[PDB]
Structure formats: structure tokens, C-alpha cells
């Protein structure tokens, strides 16, 4: 078998946006195997070594203003530029979530499941209500799952002690819709 | 914070593999084909709204190699510590018999970025319809990756996402069958 050791090199230019394109932070990072050696934080304004392995580079690059100028100006020419380039289909991309409620195949008490899938973006708010009022306790989430195809899914359970007549609602709040989505479970 | 666009690249020795891709809030926008030297978009649609001079990524990757050599040498050739992947198999949406659905094999938190993935339907490899993504960056510098198998739910079938990675002592088979 292949036993030769590997040597990896990674480079990441991360553009962080806050309030649209109001405040931008560029984070340039070099990673040797699984450790970040050098980096450029636009907030700092120059390279800083993250490990001694990175010192030669931080010191070296910082000795070239032509270079640093380009880098300082990147929050604009690079970050904001790219942001706008794909804002129509990324920042503004919206896909309504499919919601359905059905009892779990587990669980006396009845375990209710609220499946919310195929939605985008990821910020989503799902809550359980009982006869019109929030249900803080009992809830259990699967967490937000990223499918890798610009689509998200999640499951939110709600343990209950059902009574004929009761109504348990799974409310969903998401950017793709103006008013919240609701799916009730008639007890 | 609201959004993060990441340009992620890497070069690996001695497999001499490389990657160059952009990422939006976790999702891949596109990556360059090092062989065909052309931009391939995560979603066909994007290619109609923007472009990228693919040919240019190859240059960064060249510098990337040179850089790896340098680092490799000044670290006294400290090899990479393999980290086995967390593997999970889920459905694209809630499953219901004969209702077409997609199996997603989540390969997460691993390194180096070299892995072998195979789909198994009743102990036998499935090919048709399957698709996979390139390597996705992680805050901890390990990788993510997704493999896809569209299928037709049934009671009789049992699938496996067979994963191979150096950090694993033996092939890992994540079992998945209809249980609803």
C-alpha cells in the first residue's frame, strides 16, 4: 500500500461581510499541514506570524509596501467586488422550505416531528406552539444541516402528552416568506 | 457577521493534487478543473450570471506548490497527521416508499484531502446517477465533502456509503436502509 507521508499547503482568503457591504474584513491565511503559519488581517493592516514557522514570511512580505497597499485595498477591489458579483444569486437567493409534521417512529407520551427541508438561506426559525402559545420546554433539535447543494434541512421534535382537542403547531420563520409557515397537529 | 466569501486553494504532496474554489457561507460557488482548465459552477445556473478566468487559478496553484516545498523543508519535513472522517448518510428530504429521493453521504472533518467513496446497494456498487463535490474548507482547516445517490425508496434495499481514508484503520461503511 501507499505509505509515503503527505505534506499539505492551504491558502484561504476570507472576506467577512457585516451589514451588507458596510464593514468588511479580509482575512488571508496560510496553513502548512493543519496549522496556520502566517496571516493578514485587514483590521491589523499587515502580516503577522501565527507560528515561528511563519515569521520569515510575515517579516519579508511586510517589507514590501507595494504588496501591502494592494492587500489593504483588497477589502474593496477583491472583497466588495466579488460580493456584488454574485449578490443576486447568493445573498438574495431564496428557496421556500418544505414543512411537514408527523409523529416519530419512536416515543403515555407522543413524540412529534417537524421536518423542515430543502430551504435556503440557512437562517431559519422553527418553534412549537400549544393551543396558540409557545412551547419552550420539550423541544429537541437536530441542528441546521447543510446538504452541500445550496439546500438546508432540519428536524425539530416536541415531546407531548396529547389530549383530544389540543392543537400543536410547528411554526417556521424564514426569509423566503413574508408571513410565517404553520403546520398543525390535531390531537 | 452576515456573510463570508472564501477563496480556498491547496496543493498536496506527494499525490500532487490541487484545488481552487470559492465559497459562500459554507456553500461552494465554483471550483476550477485543474485538468481542463475551466470554471465549473456548483449550480448550472450561476454560470449564466457570472464568470471567472479559470486559466488564472493554475498560476496560484503553481506558487502554492513552490510554497509547500519551502514549508515542507523548513519544518524538517514534518508529515501531516491523518484525521479520519466523520461519515453520515441522510436523505435529501423525508423518505416515503417509491417516492424518488436522494441519499447524501456527508464526509466531514478529515485530512489530508484524499478519499475514496463508493455507494453500495445490497453489498454491490451503484454508479448511475451518483455525483460528488470537491473538497470544502473548514474553520479548523480539515475538509468536508458530499457524495450523492438518487434512488427509489423500497423496503427491501439496504445501502452503504463506503469510505476509505488513511486515518481509518479499515474501510468505513455507513449503513442506511428504509426504516419508516
Amino acid at each position: 500500500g501507499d505509505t509515503r507521508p503527505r505534506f499539505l499547503w492551504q491558502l484561504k482568503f476570507e472576506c467577512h461581510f457585516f451589514n451588507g457591504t458596510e464593514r468588511v474584513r479580509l482575512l488571508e491565511r496560510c496553513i502548512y499541514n493543519q496549522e496556520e503559519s502566517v496571516r493578514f488581517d485587514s483590521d491589523v493592516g499587515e502580516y503577522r506570524a501565527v507560528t515561528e514557522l511563519g515569521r520569515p514570511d510575515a517579516e519579508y512580505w511586510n517589507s514590501q509596501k507595494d504588496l501591502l497597499e494592494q492587500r489593504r485595498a483588497a477589502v474593496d477591489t477583491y472583497c466588495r467586488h466579488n460580493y456584488g458579483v454574485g449578490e443576486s444569486f447568493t445573498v438574495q437567493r431564496r428557496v421556500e422550505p418544505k414543512v411537514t409534521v408527523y409523529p416519530s417512529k419512536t416515543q403515555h407520551h407522543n413524540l412529534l416531528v417537524c421536518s423542515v427541508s430543502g430551504f435556503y438561506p440557512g437562517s431559519i426559525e422553527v418553534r412549537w406552539f400549544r393551543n396558540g402559545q409557545e412551547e419552550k420546554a420539550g423541544v429537541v433539535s437536530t441542528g441546521l444541516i447543510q446538504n452541500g447543494d445550496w439546500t438546508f434541512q432540519t428536524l425539530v421534535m416536541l415531546e407531548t402528552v396529547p389530549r383530544s382537542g389540543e392543537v400543536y403547531t410547528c411554526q417556521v420563520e424564514h426569509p423566503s416568506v413574508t408571513s410565517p409557515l404553520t403546520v398543525e397537529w390535531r390531537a | 457577521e452576515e456573510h463570508v466569501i472564501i477563496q480556498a486553494e491547496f496543493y498536496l504532496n506527494p499525490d500532487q493534487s490541487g484545488e481552487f474554489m470559492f465559497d459562500f457561507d459554507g456553500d461552494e460557488i465554483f471550483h476550477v478543473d485543474m485538468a481542463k482548465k475551466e470554471t465549473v459552477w456548483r449550480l448550472e445556473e450561476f454560470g449564466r450570471f457570472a464568470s471567472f478566468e479559470a486559466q488564472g487559478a493554475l498560476a496560484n496553484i503553481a506558487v502554492d506548490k513552490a510554497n509547500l516545498e519551502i514549508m515542507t523543508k523548513r519544518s524538517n519535513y514534518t508529515p501531516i497527521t491523518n484525521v479520519p472522517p466523520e461519515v453520515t448518510v441522510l436523505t435529501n428530504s423525508p423518505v416515503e416508499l417509491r417516492e424518488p429521493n436522494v441519499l447524501i453521504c456527508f464526509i466531514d472533518k478529515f485530512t489530508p484531502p484524499v478519499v475514496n467513496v463508493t455507494w453500495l446497494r445490497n453489498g454491490k456498487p451503484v454508479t448511475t446517477g451518483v455525483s460528488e463535490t470537491v473538497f470544502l474548507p473548514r474553520e479548523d482547516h480539515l475538509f468536508r465533502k458530499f457524495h450523492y445517490l438518487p434512488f427509489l425508496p423500497s423496503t427491501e434495499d439496504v445501502y452503504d456509503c463506503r469510505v476509505e481514508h488513511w486515518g481509518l484503520d479499515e474501510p468505513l461503511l455507513k449503513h442506511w436502509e428504509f426504516d419508516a
Binding site: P56, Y60, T77, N82 | E9, I29, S51, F52, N67
Partner: peptide
């Protein structure tokens, strides 16, 4: 609209 890249710098030698 065109995506632009950041050029990779060469390490200190």
C-alpha cells in the same frame, strides 16, 4: 460580472 482572485504570494526563501 466577473469574479476576481487574490494572487498567491511566494514564501520567504
Amino acid at each position: 460580472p466577473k469574479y476576481v482572485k487574490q494572487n498567491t504570494l511566494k514564501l520567504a526563501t
